[PDB]
């Protein structure tokens, strides 16, 4: 059995090799050893599972579009439907894997506000991924679970973290996307993103260069979504005194 | 199920970039024992190139990292063991493809261009084995790759046009084999240059579609030749 250092070293090797199943298995093993993850181990775990589920999400959108495009061909549409359902099962199993890890190991032992916000955001993300493909009688509960987790994360970070903190900015980005795509609520999605951006830009100048670089990267994403969602109108071009 | 349904599933898997599914569909088609159509042959080879390719790239990444870590030793052992795990997956993939080629693809090939395709594929997958083999094991593997390429080469020189994409692709890969596996760069260059030159003389007779098919591979030959003969005193190019 590998100790923690060997598992982290192997997860980094697997990352460079783009072997994300291996990477996630290593970081799940690290997690279940029961010690609080460091910032870099948190990033390795989250990057690994995002890529693992990300392959299915992309494949799911492709096959869904083919299923919609072949509506006049029974055999072709049925084959695409069955293949989408197969991908969905994989996707749900990955989400349930992550959600179980968050509930059983990560969230209960998060002793600092930063890490708890990170894991509650992650819980919001993976219920959101479930909500992207939920289409039966469980969608309503899943959508609510996502919003509850995001909101709990928002509550802790609003009180414990500066608005420039990358975790708080990343939470605002994804929670905004949840409102836009899952709830079909563009006005709330935009005001949430705009508020987090405005609150950060007021303090951005006070950061060290390295922290500034980190914050600005996420603030770029908030800006890009706002511009995408509001088009040429709404946003007024900027000039400088 | 039926051959046609499996082919449709393979094409769906291709669009979803799920190459394990794609490869599994086309393996089942091959195992039905009927000669593959050109479309089926390309789906099979595309699928397994992607499946094996993921390990080939991972193996090179891990090898490169392993060769650039000199401060530690237990980390060095962990990097080696991870490479050996990737190696085992790579060999199993190659052995899977080589078994299909021996049992179904090469025996059922009724036309010259098909036999050259599969003999080239056999050369390719022994070459992938040769990329990771060591010692006495490597010699036999390299010989297997060379013998397959050479038989494909002799058939294609006799029976296929020099512009045929399969003949040109054989020249390209056989040339890389000479350069990289046999450490014979001049012979690799002469093989690439001769195939390129032999195809030039008949490009004028081709349809637009065949002209593009042939020249796309001739550009890969030229790319390797430019890479292998270096810039030397070459001045960078600008276009009016």
Author numbering:
A (entry chain A): 0 to 240
B (entry chain B): 1 to 240
The authors write:
14-3-3 proteins recognize protein partners phosphorylated at serine or threonine in certain sequence motifs in all eukaryotic organisms. 14-3-3 proteins have a highly conserved dimeric all-helical structure.
The phosphopeptide establishes multiple polar interactions with the basic pocket in the amphipathic groove of 14-3-3, largely reminiscent of previously solved structures of 14-3-3–phosphopeptide complexes. The conformation of 18E6 phosphopeptide bound to 14-3-3ζ within the chimera is practically identical (RMSD = 0.17 Å upon superimposition of Cα atoms of the peptides) to the 14-3-3σ-bound conformation of a synthetic 16E6 phosphopeptide reported very recently at a lower resolution. Nonetheless, a few noteworthy differences appear in a subset of the crystallographic conformers of 14-3-3/16E6 and 14-3-3/18E6 complexes. On the other hand, Arg –6 of 18E6 (Thr in 16E6) mediates a bipartite interaction with 14-3-3 in most of the observed conformers. It simultaneously interacts with the carbonyl of Asp223 and participates in a water-mediated interaction with Asn224. Interestingly, position –6 is an Arg in the two strongest 14-3-3 binders (18E6 and 33E6) versus a Thr in the weakest ones (35E6 and 16E6).
